[PDB]
Structures are given as structure tokens and as C-alpha cells.
Amino acid sequence: ISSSFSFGGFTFKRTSGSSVKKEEEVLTGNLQTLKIRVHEGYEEFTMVGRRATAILRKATRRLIQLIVSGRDEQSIAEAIIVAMVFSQEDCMIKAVRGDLNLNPMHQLLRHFQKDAKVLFQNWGIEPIDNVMGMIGILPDMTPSTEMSLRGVRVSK
Numbered sequence: 001i002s003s004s005f006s007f008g009g010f011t012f013k014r015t016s017g018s019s020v021k022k023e024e025e026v027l028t029g030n031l032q033t034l035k036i037r038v039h040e041g042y043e044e045f046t047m048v049g050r051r052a053t054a055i056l057r058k059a060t061r062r063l064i065q066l067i068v069s070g071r072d073e074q075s076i077a078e079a080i081i082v083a084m085v086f087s088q089e090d091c092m093i094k095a096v097r098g099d100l101n102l103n104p105m106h107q108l109l110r111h112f113q114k115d116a117k118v119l120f121q122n123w124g125i126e127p128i129d130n131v132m133g134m135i136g137i138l139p140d141m142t143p144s145t146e147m148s149l150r151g152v153r154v155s156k
């Protein structure tokens with residue numbers, strides 16, 4: 001499996017861990033069957049885009065943590081969407097609200113890039129502690145000191 005690759009306009013580089021691929025069929029939130037390569041394992045990545053930078057920890061169909069820095073709200077949102085799709089989480093699969101048309105991961109990404117409101121509302125939030133250098137981000141992509149999208153923090 002490749003150590004560096006591109007997804008959603010971000011260069012990903014695996015800095016720790018490894019995964020194996022297992023083909024699985026998942027049911028989307030539009031009741032469509034999708035055949036995807038699910039990655040199994042613990043991994044850490046960097047993400048570098050033109051307008052945002054992040055560190056992503058993940059496990060099998062599970063986002064662990066995304067620490068993201070970006071130029072503005074929109075640029076941060078772009079990184080979050082890519083990370084949420086990349087995670088392969090079921091809540092992301094179940095947030096699909098269209099029939100998808102081609103690589104299935106790319107179709108998922110394009111769908112959420114078009115409108116991420118259901119993705120962000122269904123993802124979940126959590127309370128956060130005041131940690132120096134970080135802040136929370138709400139489903140509407142605005143900041144909060146007290147709560148954040150689950151597993152997501154913004155570097156500031």
C-alpha cells in the first residue's frame with residue numbers, strides 16, 4: 001500500500017501504522033449498496049493542502065483525531081470533509097442523501113463536497129477542555145471553546 005497519495009486536493013502521507021484492505025459492501029443513507037475497500041488498522045497521516053494542514057489519526061472505520069489548521073472557515077471545512085470521508089465511518093456512509101454515480105470513495109467525497117450539512121450534523125459533537133493551542137468547531141463551521149465536532153480540533 002502506497003505511503004503518499006492525494007485525496008480531495010490534499011497530499012496524504014502515512015507517518016505511523018499500516019492497514020490492510022478488505023472489500024465490503026455498505027448501505028448508504030440513500031439505501032444504495034456501495035462496494036468499498038475498507039482499510040483495517042491503526043494509522044496516522046499528515047494532510048497538506050493549498051489552504052489547510054492537518055494531522056489525522058484513524059483506526060478501522062473510525063476517526064480518532066483530526067487536528068486542523070486553515071486559512072479560513074471554508075478551508076478548514078474542506079479538510080474536515082475529506083478526513084470524515086477518508087475515515088470510512090458508518091455515520092458518514094449513513095449521511096449520504098443522494099444516489100451515487102468510478103471509485104466509490106471519490107463519489108462519496110464529491111457528494112459531501114457539494115453539501116456537508118447532513119454529514120456534519122450526524123457526525124456528533126463532544127464537550128472539550130480548554131487546551132492551549134486548540135479550539136473547537138461546531139457543525140456550522142464556527143468556533144467554540146466548549147464543544148466540538150467529535151474528534152476534531154482546530155489549531156490556533
Ligand SMILES: O=C(O)[C@H]1[C@H]2CC[C@H](CC2)[C@@H]1Nc1nc(-c2n[nH]c3ncc(F)cc23)ncc1F
Nearest residue numbers: 001002005006007019037039086087088103105
Ligand atoms: O482506495 C482508493 O482507491 C484510494 C482513493 C484515493 C486516495 C485513497 C482514498 C480513496 C485511496 N488510496 C490509498 N488509501 C490508503 C489508505 N490507508 N488507510 C486508509 N483508510 C481509509 C481509506 F479510505 C484509504 C486508506 N493508503 C494508500 C492509498 F494509496
